C-alpha cells in the first residue's frame, strides 16, 4: 500500500471492478473473495491489481506493439479498447463481428498474426480465443466469474459487464504499459481521464 | 441406433408403470409414454357465448359459464397422426419446455 | 472388495501423472507400496513423498513432476525364474534402453537389473517407465 497503490485500488473500487454476476466457473474459485447474501459474487481486488501489472509486463515484452491485438465484442469495450489500442499503438478489432478465419485463414481480409491477444469477455469473444488456439497465440483476458478459462493464459478478474469497469481496467493497463515503456514517469499522474474510455450513449 | 435416450417414456427407478387407454383409440399405452395434455376449454363458440350470456338468468355471474376440463391421454400413433405432437429434427428432438 | 493395495496405489498414481496433477493423495498403503515408491524415487521418476499416520492403514502424499509414462502392477504375481527375465523385459518394457520391472526376491524387492546383479528372481510385482 503505497500512495500509488492506494490510488490504484481506490480507482478500481470506484469503478466497481470487483462486482461479479452469480455463477462461478469453478476455474475462478481462487479469484473470488466474498459470496454475498444477495448472490453478488465479490472479487479479491489485489488479484486484479496484480494481474493488471503482470499483463502490462507481457505487453511491454512484445518488441513491436502492432503484434499485440485487442479484441472486443460488446459495445462498452468497443470505445474503451479502441482508445486502448490508441495509446498502446496496437491493433483493434472494431467491428463487433469477428470474422471466423481471422487468425486461421491467411486469405481473409481481416487476417492478423499477433504475438499476443487480449480479449474483453472470454465468453463473448470466444471465437477469437478458439482461433488463437489453432495458432500458438497466448491470451490475456478480462474475466468475470461466469467466464471460461479454457485456452486463457493471463486472467485479470474484472466486471466485464459495465463500461466503468472495463474502461478503467483497459485504462490502468494502458497507464502501466506507458510507465514500463518509459513513455511515462512512475511517480507522475496521467492527464488522460478514464472518462474517455467510457461508452457514450 | 438408439433413437432416444429417454426411449420415449419418462420412467426410471422402477420395473413397471400403469397402462392407460388412449382417448382417441383406446389402445393401452404406458402412463410415462403417453402424450398427455390437460385441456381447459370453454363449452361454447365465442359467438354462441354472446348469445347465451344474453339469456343468463342469474346476472350475478362473472364469467359464470363453466370451463370444460379434460385430461387427454394419447397413444403415440394417435398423437402423431392427430398432430398433437409432430416430427422434429435430431437436435430439437431433445427440447423440453417449448410452447410460446 | 479390496485386493492388492499396490494395484490401487499404482493406478491412482498413474492416473494423476496422466492428468498433469502436481501431487497424489494415496490410500491405503503398505510396506510394499512404500518400498515401491522408494524404488521409483531412487530411480528418478517420482519426487519427494510424505507418509501420514492415521491410526489405521495410512495415507501417502506423492510429489510428482512428470516422468512416469506408465507404472503398473502385474497380478497375479507370477513366478519369474532368472531364465524368464528376457520374456518379461521384452513384453512389459518400452525399450531395452530403460524402464524397470520390479520383483520380490528372498533378497528383497528389486529392479530386475538389481536381480541380475544379485543373481536371483522369482516374484513379479509391477513395472514403471
Amino acid at each position: 500500500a503505497t500512495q500509488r497503490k492506494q490510488d490504484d485500488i481506490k480507482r478500481l473500487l470506484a469503478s466497481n471492478c470487483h462486482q461479479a454476476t452469480i455463477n462461478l466457473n469453478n476455474q475462478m474459485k481462487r479469484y473470488i473473495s466474498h459470496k454475498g447474501v444477495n448472490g453478488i459474487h465479490y472479487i479479491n481486488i489485489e488479484e486484479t491489481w496484480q494481474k493488471i501489472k503482470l499483463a502490462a509486463r507481457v505487453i511491454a515484452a512484445v518488441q513491436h506493439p502492432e503484434d499485440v491485438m485487442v479484441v472486443c465484442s460488446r459495445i462498452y469495450g468497443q470505445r474503451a479498447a479502441i482508445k486502448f489500442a490508441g495509446y498502446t499503438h496496437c491493433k483493434s478489432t472494431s467491428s463487433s463481428r469477428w470474422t471466423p478465419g481471422t487468425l486461421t485463414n491467411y486469405q481473409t481480409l481481416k487476417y492478423e498474426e499477433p504475438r499476443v491477444l487480449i480479449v474483453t469477455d472470454p465468453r463473448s469473444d470466444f471465437q477469437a480465443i478458439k482461433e488463437a488456439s489453432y495458432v500458438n497465440i497466448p491470451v490475456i483476458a478480462l474475466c468475470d466469474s461466469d467466464s471460461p478459462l479454457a485456452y486463457v493464459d493471463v486472467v485479470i478478474p474484472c466486471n466485464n459487464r459495465s463500461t466503468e469497469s472495463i474502461s478503467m481496467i483497459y485504462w490502468m493497463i494502458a497507464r502501466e504499459v506507458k510507465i514500463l515503456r518509459g513513455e511515462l514517469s512512475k511517480d507522475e499522474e496521467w492527464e488522460v481521464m478514464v472518462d474517455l474510455f467510457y461508452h457514450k450513449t | 441406433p438408439v433413437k432416444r435416450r429417454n426411449a420415449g417414456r419418462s420412467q426410471k427407478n422402477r420395473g413397471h408403470t400403469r397402462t392407460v387407454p388412449c382417448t382417441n383409440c383406446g389402445r393401452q399405452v404406458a402412463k410415462d409414454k403417453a402424450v398427455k395434455r390437460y385441456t381447459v376449454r370453454d363449452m361454447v363458440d365465442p359467438s354462441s357465448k354472446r348469445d347465451i350470456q344474453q339469456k343468463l338468468a342469474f346476472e350475478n355471474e362473472k364469467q359464470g359459464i363453466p370451463k370444460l376440463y379434460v385430461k387427454l391421454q394419447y397413444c403415440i400413433s394417435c398423437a402423431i397422426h392427430s398432430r398433437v405432437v409432430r416430427v422434429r429434427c435430431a437436435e430439437d428432438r431433445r427440447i423440453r419446455r417449448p410452447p410460446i | 472388495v479390496k485386493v492388492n493395495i499396490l494395484a490401487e496405489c499404482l493406478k491412482d498414481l498413474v492416473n494423476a501423472e496422466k492428468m498433469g496433477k502436481k501431487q497424489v493423495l494415496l490410500r491405503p498403503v503398505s510396506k510394499v507400496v512404500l518400498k515401491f515408491l522408494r524404488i521409483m524415487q531412487k530411480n528418478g521418476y517420482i519426487g519427494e513423498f510424505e507418509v501420514i499416520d492415521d491410526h489405521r492403514s495410512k495415507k501417502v502424499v506423492v510429489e510428482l513432476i512428470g516422468r512416469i509414462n506408465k507404472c503398473g502392477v502385474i497380478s497375479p504375481r507370477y513366478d519369474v525364474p532368472l531364465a524368464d527375465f528376457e520374456k518379461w523385459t521384452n513384453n512389459i518394457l518400452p525399450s531395452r534402453q530403460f524402464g524397470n520391472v520390479v520383483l520380490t526376491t528372498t533378497y528383497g524387492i528389486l529392479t530386475h537389473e538389481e536381480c541380475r546383479k544379485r543373481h536371483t528372481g522369482g516374484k513379479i510385482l509391477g513395472f514403471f517407465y
Binding site: V62, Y106, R115, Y134, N136 | - | R67, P94, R96
Partner: protein
Amino acid sequence: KNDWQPQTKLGRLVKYGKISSLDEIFKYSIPIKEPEIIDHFYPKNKDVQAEHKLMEEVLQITPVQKQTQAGQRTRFKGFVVVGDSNGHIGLGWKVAKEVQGAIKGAITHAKLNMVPVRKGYWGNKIANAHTIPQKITGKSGSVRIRLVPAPRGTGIVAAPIPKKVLQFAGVQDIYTSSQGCTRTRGNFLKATYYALANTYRYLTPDFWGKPEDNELPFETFSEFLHTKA
C-alpha cells in the same frame, strides 16, 4: 509467376533465408501453411547423392462417388507421401474431379503435414540410429499399428504400405504389428504416419533435464518483419 511471394510470417522468414533449418521450425512449433517453405529447404539444383533429396510418392487414387440431384458424380481422392530418408516425413490427401489435380493438391497437403520422426538405438549405441527409441502406436479409424524397435539390419518388417511410409521416414530397422481393417489404405497410412509422429511425443529418460530457453524466431526477427516490402 514462378517466384514465391510468402503469405505467412514464417513464409517471409524462410524465403529471405532467415530461419536456419527445417527442424528449427518444428522446434518452435510454428504452423506451416505454405507448401513452398518445404521446397525451400530441399533444393532442386539436383545433386544426385544427397540423402536429403525430397521424395514424393502417390500411394492411392480412388474413384469416389456421390449421388446428387439424380446424377452420380465422381471425384478422385489421392494419398501422397513426402520424405527425405533423413528424419522427415509427411502424408497428405486430396479430393478433386481431375486426377493430376488430386495428386498435386495431395502433394501440397503432404508438405503442409511434415513431421519430425525421432531415431533411436536398439542395442549398444554405435553409429547410425537405425530405429526408434521406444515402441509406439498409430491409430486411425479402426486400424492400429505398433512400431517396435529392431536390432541392426533386421530391416523393415511391415506390410507394403507402412513399409513405404517407414522407408520414406528413414527408419532402417523395425518390427511391425497391426490391428483393425488394414485394407482401408488411408487409415493404414494415416496410422503409420501418426505413429511415426508420436516418436517425439514420448518423454524418454534422456529428455528429463532442463531444456534451453530461447526466444521465438518472430521475437528475434521482429525488426525484419516490420519493414515494408
